Amino acid sequence: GLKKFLEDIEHHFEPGGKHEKWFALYEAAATLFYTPGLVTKRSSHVRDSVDLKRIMIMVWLAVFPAMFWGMYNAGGQAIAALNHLYSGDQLAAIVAGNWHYWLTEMLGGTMSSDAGWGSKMLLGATYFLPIYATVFIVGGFWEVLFCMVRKHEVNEGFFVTSILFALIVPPTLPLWQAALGITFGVVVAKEVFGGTGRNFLNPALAGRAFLFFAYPAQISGDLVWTAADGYSGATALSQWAQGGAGALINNATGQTITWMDAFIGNIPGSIGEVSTLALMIGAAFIVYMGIASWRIIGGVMIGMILLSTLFNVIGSDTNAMFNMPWHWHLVLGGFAFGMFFMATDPVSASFTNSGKWAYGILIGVMCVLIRVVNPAYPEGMMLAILFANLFAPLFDHVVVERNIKRRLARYG
Amino acid sequence: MITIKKGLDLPIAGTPSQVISDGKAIKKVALLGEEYVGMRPTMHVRVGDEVKKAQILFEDKKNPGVKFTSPVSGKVVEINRGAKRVLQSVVIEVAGDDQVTFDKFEANQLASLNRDAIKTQLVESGLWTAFRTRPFSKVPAIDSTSEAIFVTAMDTNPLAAEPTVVINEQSEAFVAGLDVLSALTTGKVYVCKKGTSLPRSQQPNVEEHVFDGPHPAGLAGTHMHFLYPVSADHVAWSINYQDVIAVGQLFLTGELYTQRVVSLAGPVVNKPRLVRTVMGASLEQLVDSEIMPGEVRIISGSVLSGTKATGPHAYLGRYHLQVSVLREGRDKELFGWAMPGKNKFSVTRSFLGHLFKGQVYNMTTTTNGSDRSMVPIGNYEKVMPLDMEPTLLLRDLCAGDSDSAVRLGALELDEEDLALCTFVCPGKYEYGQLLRECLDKIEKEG
Amino acid sequence: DSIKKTLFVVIALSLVCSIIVSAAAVGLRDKQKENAALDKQSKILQVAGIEAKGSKQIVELFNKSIEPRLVDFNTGDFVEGDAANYDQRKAAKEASESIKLTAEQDKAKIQRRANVGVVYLVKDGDKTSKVILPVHGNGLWSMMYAFVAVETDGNTVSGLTYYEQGETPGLGGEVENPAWRAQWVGKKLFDENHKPAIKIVKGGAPQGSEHGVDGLSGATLTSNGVQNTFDFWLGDMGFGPFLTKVRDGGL
Amino acid sequence: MSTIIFGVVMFTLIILALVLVILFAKSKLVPTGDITISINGDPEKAIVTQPGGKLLTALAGAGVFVSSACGGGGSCGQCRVKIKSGGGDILPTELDHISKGEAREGERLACQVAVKADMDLELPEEIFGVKKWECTVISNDNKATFIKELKLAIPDGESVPFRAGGYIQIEAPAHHVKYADFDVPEKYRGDWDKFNLFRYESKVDEPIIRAYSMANYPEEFGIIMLNVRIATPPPNNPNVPPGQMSSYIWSLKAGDKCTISGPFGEFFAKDTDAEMVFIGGGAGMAPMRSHIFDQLKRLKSKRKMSYWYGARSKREMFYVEDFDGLAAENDNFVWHCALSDPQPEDNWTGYTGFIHNVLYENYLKDHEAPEDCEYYMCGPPMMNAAVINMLKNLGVEEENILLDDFGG
Amino acid sequence: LKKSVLAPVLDNNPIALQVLGVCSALAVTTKLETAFVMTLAVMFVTALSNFFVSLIRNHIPNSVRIIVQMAIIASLVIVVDQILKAYLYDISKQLSVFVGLIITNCIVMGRAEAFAMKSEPIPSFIDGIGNGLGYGFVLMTVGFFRELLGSGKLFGLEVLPLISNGGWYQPNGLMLLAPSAFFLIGFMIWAIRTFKPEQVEAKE
Amino acid sequence: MEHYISLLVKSIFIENMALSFFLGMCTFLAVSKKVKTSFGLGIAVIVVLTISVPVNNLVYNLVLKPDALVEGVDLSFLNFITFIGVIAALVQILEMILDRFFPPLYNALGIFLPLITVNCAIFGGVSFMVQRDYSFAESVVYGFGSGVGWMLAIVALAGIREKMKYSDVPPGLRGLGITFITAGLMALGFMSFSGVQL
Numbered sequence A: 001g002l003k004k005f006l007e008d009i010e011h012h013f014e015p016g017g018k019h020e021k022w023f024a025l026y027e028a029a030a031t032l033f034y035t036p037g038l039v040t041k042r043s044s045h046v047r048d049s050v051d052l053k054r055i056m057i058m059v060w061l062a063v064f065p066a067m068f069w070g071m072y073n074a075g076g077q078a079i080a081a082l083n084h085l086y087s088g089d090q091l092a093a094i095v096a097g098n099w100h101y102w103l104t105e106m107l108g109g110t111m112s113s114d115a116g117w118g119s120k121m122l123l124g125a126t127y128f129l130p131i132y133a134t135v136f137i138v139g140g141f142w143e144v145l146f147c148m149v150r151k152h153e154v155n156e157g158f159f160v161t162s163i164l165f166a167l168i169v170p171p172t173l174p175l176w177q178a179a180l181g182i183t184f185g186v187v188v189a190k191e192v193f194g195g196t197g198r199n200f201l202n203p204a205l206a207g208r209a210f211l212f213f214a215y216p217a218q219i220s221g222d223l224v225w226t227a228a229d230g231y232s233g234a235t236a237l238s239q240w241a242q243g244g245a246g247a248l249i250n251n252a253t254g255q256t257i258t259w260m261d262a263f264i265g266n267i268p269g270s271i272g273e274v275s276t277l278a279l280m281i282g283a284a285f286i287v288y289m290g291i292a293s294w295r296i297i298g299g300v301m302i303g304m305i306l307l308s309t310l311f312n313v314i315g316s317d318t319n320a321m322f323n324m325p326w327h328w329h330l331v332l333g334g335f336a337f338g339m340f341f342m343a344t345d346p347v348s349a350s351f352t353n354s355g356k357w358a359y360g361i362l363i364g365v366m367c368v369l370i371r372v373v374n375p376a377y378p379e380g381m382m383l384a385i386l387f388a389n390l391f392a393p394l395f396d397h398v399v400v401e402r403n404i405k406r407r408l409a410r411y412g
Numbered sequence B: 001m002i003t004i005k006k007g008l009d010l011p012i013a014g015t016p017s018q019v020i021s022d023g024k025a026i027k028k029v030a031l032l033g034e035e036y037v038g039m040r041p042t043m044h045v046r047v048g049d050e051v052k053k054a055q056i057l058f059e060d061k062k063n064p065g066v067k068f069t070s071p072v073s074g075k076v077v078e079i080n081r082g083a084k085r086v087l088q089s090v091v092i093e094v095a096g097d098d099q100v101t102f103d104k105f106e107a108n109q110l111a112s113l114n115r116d117a118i119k120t121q122l123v124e125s126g127l128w129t130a131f132r133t134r135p136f137s138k139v140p141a142i143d144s145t146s147e148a149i150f151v152t153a154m155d156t157n158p159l160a161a162e163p164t165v166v167i168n169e170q171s172e173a174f175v176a177g178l179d180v181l182s183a184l185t186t187g188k189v190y191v192c193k194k195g196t197s198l199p200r201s202q203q204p205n206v207e208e209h210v211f212d213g214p215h216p217a218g219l220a221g222t223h224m225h226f227l228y229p230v231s232a233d234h235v236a237w238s239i240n241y242q243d244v245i246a247v248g249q250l251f252l253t254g255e256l257y258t259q260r261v262v263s264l265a266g267p268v269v270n271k272p273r274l275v276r277t278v279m280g281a282s283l284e285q286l287v288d289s290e291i292m293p294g295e296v297r298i299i300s301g302s303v304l305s306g307t308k309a310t311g312p313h314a315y316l317g318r319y320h321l322q323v324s325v326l327r328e329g330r331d332k333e334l335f336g337w338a339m340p341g342k343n344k345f346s347v348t349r350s351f352l353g354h355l356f357k358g359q360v361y362n363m364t365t366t367t368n369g370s371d372r373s374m375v376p377i378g379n380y381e382k383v384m385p386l387d388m389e390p391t392l393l394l395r396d397l398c399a400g401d402s403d404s405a406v407r408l409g410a411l412e413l414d415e416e417d418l419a420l421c422t423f424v425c426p427g428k429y430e431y432g433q434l435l436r437e438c439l440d441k442i443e444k445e446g
Numbered sequence C: 001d002s003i004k005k006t007l008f009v010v011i012a013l014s015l016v017c018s019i020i021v022s023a024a025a026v027g028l029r030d031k032q033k034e035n036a037a038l039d040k041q042s043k044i045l046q047v048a049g050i051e052a053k054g055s056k057q058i059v060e061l062f063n064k065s066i067e068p069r070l071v072d073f074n075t076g077d078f079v080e081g082d083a084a085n086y087d088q089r090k091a092a093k094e095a096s097e098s099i100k101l102t103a104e105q106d107k108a109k110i111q112r113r114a115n116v117g118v119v120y121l122v123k124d125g126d127k128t129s130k131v132i133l134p135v136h137g138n139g140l141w142s143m144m145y146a147f148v149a150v151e152t153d154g155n156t157v158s159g160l161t162y163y164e165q166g167e168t169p170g171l172g173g174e175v176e177n178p179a180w181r182a183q184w185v186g187k188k189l190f191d192e193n194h195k196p197a198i199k200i201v202k203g204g205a206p207q208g209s210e211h212g213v214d215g216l217s218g219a220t221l222t223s224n225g226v227q228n229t230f231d232f233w234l235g236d237m238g239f240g241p242f243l244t245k246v247r248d249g250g251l
Numbered sequence D: 001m002s003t004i005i006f007g008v009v010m011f012t013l014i015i016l017a018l019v020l021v022i023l024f025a026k027s028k029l030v031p032t033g034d035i036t037i038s039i040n041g042d043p044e045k046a047i048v049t050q051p052g053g054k055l056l057t058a059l060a061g062a063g064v065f066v067s068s069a070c071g072g073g074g075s076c077g078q079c080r081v082k083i084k085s086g087g088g089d090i091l092p093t094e095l096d097h098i099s100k101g102e103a104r105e106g107e108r109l110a111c112q113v114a115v116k117a118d119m120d121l122e123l124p125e126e127i128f129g130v131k132k133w134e135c136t137v138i139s140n141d142n143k144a145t146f147i148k149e150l151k152l153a154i155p156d157g158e159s160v161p162f163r164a165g166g167y168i169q170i171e172a173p174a175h176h177v178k179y180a181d182f183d184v185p186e187k188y189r190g191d192w193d194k195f196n197l198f199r200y201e202s203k204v205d206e207p208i209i210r211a212y213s214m215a216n217y218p219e220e221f222g223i224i225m226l227n228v229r230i231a232t233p234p235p236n237n238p239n240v241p242p243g244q245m246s247s248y249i250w251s252l253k254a255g256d257k258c259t260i261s262g263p264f265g266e267f268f269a270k271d272t273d274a275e276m277v278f279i280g281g282g283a284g285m286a287p288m289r290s291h292i293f294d295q296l297k298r299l300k301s302k303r304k305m306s307y308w309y310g311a312r313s314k315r316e317m318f319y320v321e322d323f324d325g326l327a328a329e330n331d332n333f334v335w336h337c338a339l340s341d342p343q344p345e346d347n348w349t350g351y352t353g354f355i356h357n358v359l360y361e362n363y364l365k366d367h368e369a370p371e372d373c374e375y376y377m378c379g380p381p382m383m384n385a386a387v388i389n390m391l392k393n394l395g396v397e398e399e400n401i402l403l404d405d406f407g408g
Numbered sequence E: 001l002k003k004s005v006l007a008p009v010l011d012n013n014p015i016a017l018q019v020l021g022v023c024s025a026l027a028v029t030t031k032l033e034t035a036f037v038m039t040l041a042v043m044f045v046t047a048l049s050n051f052f053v054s055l056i057r058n059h060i061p062n063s064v065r066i067i068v069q070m071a072i073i074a075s076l077v078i079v080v081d082q083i084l085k086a087y088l089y090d091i092s093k094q095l096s097v098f099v100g101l102i103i104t105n106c107i108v109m110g111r112a113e114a115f116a117m118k119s120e121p122i123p124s125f126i127d128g129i130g131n132g133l134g135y136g137f138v139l140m141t142v143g144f145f146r147e148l149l150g151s152g153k154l155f156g157l158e159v160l161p162l163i164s165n166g167g168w169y170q171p172n173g174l175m176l177l178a179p180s181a182f183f184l185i186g187f188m189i190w191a192i193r194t195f196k197p198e199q200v201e202a203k204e
Numbered sequence F: 001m002e003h004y005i006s007l008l009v010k011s012i013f014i015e016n017m018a019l020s021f022f023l024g025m026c027t028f029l030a031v032s033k034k035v036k037t038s039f040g041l042g043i044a045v046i047v048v049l050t051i052s053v054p055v056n057n058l059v060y061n062l063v064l065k066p067d068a069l070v071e072g073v074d075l076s077f078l079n080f081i082t083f084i085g086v087i088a089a090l091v092q093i094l095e096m097i098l099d100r101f102f103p104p105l106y107n108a109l110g111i112f113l114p115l116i117t118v119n120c121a122i123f124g125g126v127s128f129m130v131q132r133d134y135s136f137a138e139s140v141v142y143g144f145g146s147g148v149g150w151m152l153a154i155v156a157l158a159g160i161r162e163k164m165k166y167s168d169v170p171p172g173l174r175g176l177g178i179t180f181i182t183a184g185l186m187a188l189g190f191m192s193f194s195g196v197q198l
């Protein structure tokens, strides 16, 4: 009987009623469960079946395998690094000192080395769910506030924005920093320009750039990527830089990092970016449907392969990042996350089919450039996408100015 | 030939059987005043006056000389006026058998007629309104002239009639009309058709061209884009095959030929077929007994571009050659935007419907969503074959920039040219109105 | 009476402006030079352990205690000259009095080294307390300059100061943290074999070690700069022969 | 003192070198020669001005008078000249006053044009027939409470050739005026003493020009009759200065002299052979009297006419005998007036309220075709915008609606 | 009157409405010391330039007006630079190249051309003072926010205790970087045109 | 061969004058509505910088350097007046000569010369050249590269502001506020070349 309830109180929220101030919150909750039931007004009497809700929910559902594997891997790396350092009665005092650990043990899990896949996903969930809840609440506040004050209806997109921002952050991020980051991403990069479809940047990447340059020590270094108290370890793009492929070693276990480990995702890093296989599984589904752009993906791959092979060819004896081939650039860091789900943003990208190729090529080239010849930062995906977001309109300008010359010759 | 590869053939139920069957006798016709763009009438008759066939009903203030005449004899019964006292229809009740007659000619004299004689006979008979000029899709002036005149000998609209089935009953009138149109132009006449053969003319400048592909292709816009690109300094005239038959019959017998052959089709029509009818006939009498019990929408023209015919608009338009009928979709469903739709049509591949090929859909008038902002996922590029940038042009139309739209190619377009972009938009924009606003601003500024 | 007027106006205005400007510029040169010298004097007095506030005390104590000297790097003994106004930063640029380091010698990535350097002797009465050496090296974002006070025995460090650097305000710009700088008091530069033995340890250094200083937390790339500049300037291409000779005596 | 002398000498020499270099460059690089302006075809007689200057100022230099309102700058926007060859550009006032109105032939606002290159213009003869005059006031008296009939006598017996609806511009010099010198009769002294209006005073210290609309049809010779409304401070802020021109005209009396510019033109009647409907109000009785009289007397046309004047009392109504002197023998002319709130001393037996409610209800509501008529209106800002709203809700085209804003 | 000296603060702001002088406002607002010193310097130079150009407004040749005005302005800023290096050497080094860029600061030449060439000497002085005050308003506000948030201290005085030195506040990194000045000035313009809707620009 | 390549790439990308150094922001923010006008102004800036920086390097090294003209005399307090005079004179003579001899090029670019006749961009260019003590060829390359980088930044801002015709900005932020926020986001974008030591 949910349908009839939402119909009786609809008069309360339309103009002239006592509750006219909360119309945007009623419409967003009414149209979630049921379809509006509207008919066409003019001169196109049949419409397609697709809308923005499905376009957004198909991208929201595509990162679920990556999210689940990220939780599993976070818990597993934490448990392994914990058992590496402590044993006996000093591991119990470590477990009793952290709520992430004693809640995991209370709900049924275990912090010992022989923990199954269930005890690891539980710890990863204890790390991931507070961040996602904080991000969702704080960003939805600003979203609804703007749509209320400006007297509009709530556009779609923040589901994807929030889930992406919550999966591209380290597992040990403080909650107030996540709140400030989602505030800067939603308000300064999206909502100040008019909402969905009207900005020119990526809001999730704008919020993560806010956190990287403002508080650079909770999103960098060796103490943020394995949620283990007292453990210090380096990731593989910051171990290749200091010694090459011979330096890729897992200190918590003493095992070499093979290429399959990075492809499958048994490596430390940002919550969801680790599993290239799961990212491919989702990206194939959303590329088949026609939502993500295979032109942008192909351009990113072309740029990465070309610049990688050029660096491999010219060579260098002091910089160990010249040796890294194209198939290693693909599985390390967040290149697949940004190539598949964050570069394919329709609003931030180019609008022309011949400009999308240049957009993707610029993204890939800038990523490999910041990876290799910038000593300060171990990757460059959030900065190469942010850099290409500014020149995306310029490629469209070039293309459309070439198009206008064909029309004046009377051939187009 | 020219092959269109980007388009969309709409899968919809109720396609007609291409056999010309007789129709109901109509008791009242009308002239819809709101389909002529930029038209401000000067009424020549009042309620209660009796009229004759081809007798002037009103005139145009913005276009001097252009006459609008009566499709049938009878007597004026009502004049419908709406918001801000705008003219909606002039309804005549069929009666009597009085008409106005003109000069008659022979078939060999027609190619050597004088252009001003042709013009005067057309304007006097009121057949000048069958023409439309690109840009702005208006009725041509009385003193103007064109180098390119396009004959629409095809139709790729959904649920539309095949032109050849009708032309093969009026071959000789079609040829006479093509000859008159060869004498009326200073350039050439382009007969845009499909592969099948049509009655042909032995004149030099009359020439046939062939188009193949889905439907953007049966439109005069693509024909002009691919044969005579238009601009402010080049203007082309457009006409369809039934009006060419009307021209030929006028010049061959001296009387006006106000018959039609429309297709009565739709997902709710019991027996879809081709129906003989009169110009501007009453749709509420034409669809009587040929629909299913329920709440339906009657349309004059396509579902892609037409006129919802209710009340004072329930009459066949001037440039429309079919009637479409389909149900009104007002149902609400739990999480309908998220369900897997086997019976849901889309240009994208999100639903399970595209996996079943050859499926026909019982579409309704539902907007499958709410009005939102434009997020470009690449749907406009899939359904537009012209050499334009659709996303940038449509954003210029949305924003209200006329100068940029003209550079991006608005002067080539019509409302029928963006009906499919309106169809496949996830933000539920209607681009015909935006382009009409842009063209109004352009035509006013200059 | 038109171009004449223009030229007369511009000449008069230029005369007035030039008189005022050239009077202001030449009159203040000495005060500008003292303002330039006082900051370096204060930093040297700070690293030397002497406390002084105000231009009065700064100039008095610097003139009474600190005695600059010129040292030739290759030979390692004092060379005569006016050390109070020597400019090593600019002497390193001119190829007349500089050298180009080999890629194997250039551990600190400075690419150029002057022939003679200036050191400051801290004097207590008529005896020498300690020696202050200027060293510099390249970090992740900038060239970091420092002052280090070596005792008379040639090993023991009594202080450290980084008076110029542009590293990130709370990651590697912690070379100016007093709690970090106080870890250098007592550390020994050279071992028993007289090797360079200062180590900036990643991840904490054992308490009681004589050669170990803690690294910067989350800045292994500004900690590498410190380690490299120290193992260079403590080498044979820097202050190594001078430190060996002062260890033998002669101070 | 070794460096101060060097500094002074070097500063002086460097600045002198730069100045001399710039002068030597400009001496050879900037043209300066003969520049002509040939207008309306080419009888080689032209305006030969030096390359430095402005266009409309160069035109006005030699007996050519274009319509200017604020001394120049681009407020009004009626200095439209044809530029067949000259400066090709559009300047900020062109976008605001000749907004888009695409001019392929080339008609730019003369104010913004540059005379540096050579100019080639096309100027219609109606600009060449304007002249200045020195007229004397025949009479100056109230016809309403705040309306005065300024009548001038053109000397020499020569009379101004103009058309009904044109407007002269009035020239007044620096002066001082005070309100207690006005000729307000006893019939109209009531409201003045009630707001204490006689306390105001003004003085202007520069020349000024404002445009005024003749109230006599052209066949009346040797006369220019004008109806002026004095512009006192608005009641919300009575501190600000009053109107300086409208107050000047009220000061003039029989035996003075006034100076006027030649016939300017806009807002002319058409010959479509349609019905004419006139709606006047306020000091807008001037263009309506010229329009209604030009038709019945000179043109002798039989178009169906009408006049609807909206006053505030019977005291506010003037020219009532002249109009009835027209409608009585010319049966195709009818006129009505409508008082808003007549004082009880009036005892009015006609219509009340505003004119758009009296014009619609009595006449246009039951009209066969309201869109076929032509509407000429001239009144205050409140009346103008209220009627044009009503006419549009009747389907009338802005090509049938002729409006005469008073520029305010 | 006080109108001319207090209108540029909110009614007609140089940076907020008449855009002029953004280059130094984006650069020196990291420290409230440098902001105060630059405000004083701009006041002094703009006022003196207005005074002298208004004095010599009659005899300036119109062919080389810019050379004369730049001579006056550059002499003034040169003596200012000499005075700064002798008495405030700490701040003079922090002002890397923006002490000499008061020449090409736009407020100076804007007030010199638009107002000093047409007015008496005394009113031009008050005009220059008012423009310096309006400039310093934005300078000091942006500097307050950036210095308090990015480093936890005001005028070099510890107000918020830093975690590194044993406190509770962790300072923000962007406030000491390039983009933060843009956001602070944009939000200040938002707040200004919120209380004074006279300055809101047209629909398009 | 390669010492001037690194200088050009550095001046264009690693140290952008518009976004990293904040030089010339009034024209950068005011004249960035259309890509055409932005392109014209950028070309004018490139030309003026490329002509102005070498001339001032030459004048400095010849007369104004310490001990350049006579031993013991330092006339380096005249830097500001000399540089601003050279810049103004060159810009004025440029607009004159192009107006008289090439009316096409004059209507193309000389319309954008009256703006940059006294600009913080060019004054800061010559000031940084003085600070860094370049050679003649290094001055030419530095000026050209910095002008090209300024042009790139302004053309990108103009492209963004042309794309933003579909935006819906609050009324208090229409114009200046949203342009300042856009420039800040562009600076976050160009912060990619931070740690590059070129």
Ligand SMILES: Cc1cc2nc3c(=O)[nH]c(=O)nc-3n(C[C@H](O)[C@H](O)[C@H](O)COP(=O)(O)OP(=O)(O)OC[C@H]3O[C@@H](n4cnc5c(N)ncnc54)[C@H](O)[C@@H]3O)c2cc1C
Pocket (backbone or CB within 6 Å): D167, D210, D211, D212, D213, D226, D227, D228, D229, D230, D231, D232, D233, D234, D240, D241, D242, D243, D244, D245, D246, D247, D283, D286, D405, D406, D407, D408
């Ligand atoms: C073609 C044409 C024909 C015209 N015909 C006529 C005609 O027949 N009769 C007629 O009367 N006018 C006519 N006008 C209008 C004419 O141009 C003047 O507007 C009119 O004569 C009064 O001018 P003014 O000098 O009083 O205006 P102003 O003196 O400029 O202003 C008068 C009013 O403005 C107010 N005011 C002044 N300064 C301010 C301020 N700072 N803030 C607010 N309010 C202020 C005064 O209090 C006063 O109410 C015509 C105009 C045109 C274009």
Ligand SMILES: CC(C)=CCC/C(C)=C/CC/C(C)=C/Cc1c(C)[nH]c2ccccc2c1=O
Pocket (backbone or CB within 6 Å): A028, A029, A032, A052, A053, A054, A056, A057, A139, A140, A141, A143, A144, A154, A155, A156, A157, A158, A159, A160
């Ligand atoms: C959800 C709810 C009950 C109320 C909204 C209140 C709230 C705190 C949400 C903030 C997040 C937000 C604004 C999302 C927009 C959005 C909606 C509402 N429905 C969506 C539905 C489908 C797909 C995407 C979206 C989407 O993207």
Ligand SMILES: Cc1cc2nc3c(=O)[nH]c(=O)nc-3n(C[C@H](O)[C@H](O)[C@H](O)CO)c2cc1C
Pocket (backbone or CB within 6 Å): A055, A056, A059, A156, A157, A158, A160, A161, A164, A190, A195, A196, A197, A198, A199, A201, A202, A203, A204, A205, A291, A292, A341, A342, A343, A344, A345, A346, A347, A348
């Ligand atoms: C393929 C696709 C990719 C998307 N990627 C992002 C993203 O990376 N960051 C984000 O905040 N929103 C993303 N969105 C959501 C939406 O595009 C975003 O809110 C717009 O960029 C805002 O106008 C994506 C949406 C789709 C359909």
Ligand code: FES
Pocket (backbone or CB within 6 Å): D067, D068, D069, D070, D071, D072, D073, D074, D075, D076, D077, D078, D079, D111
């Ligand atoms: S006065 Fe306004 S245009 Fe000349």
Ligand code: FES
Pocket (backbone or CB within 6 Å): E020, E021, E022, E023, E024, E104, E105, E106, F023, F024, F025, F026, F027, F118, F119, F120, F121
């Ligand atoms: S201050 Fe921005 S241009 Fe001079």
Ligand SMILES: [Ca+2]
Pocket (backbone or CB within 6 Å): C089, C092, C110, C112
């Ligand atoms: Ca050095």
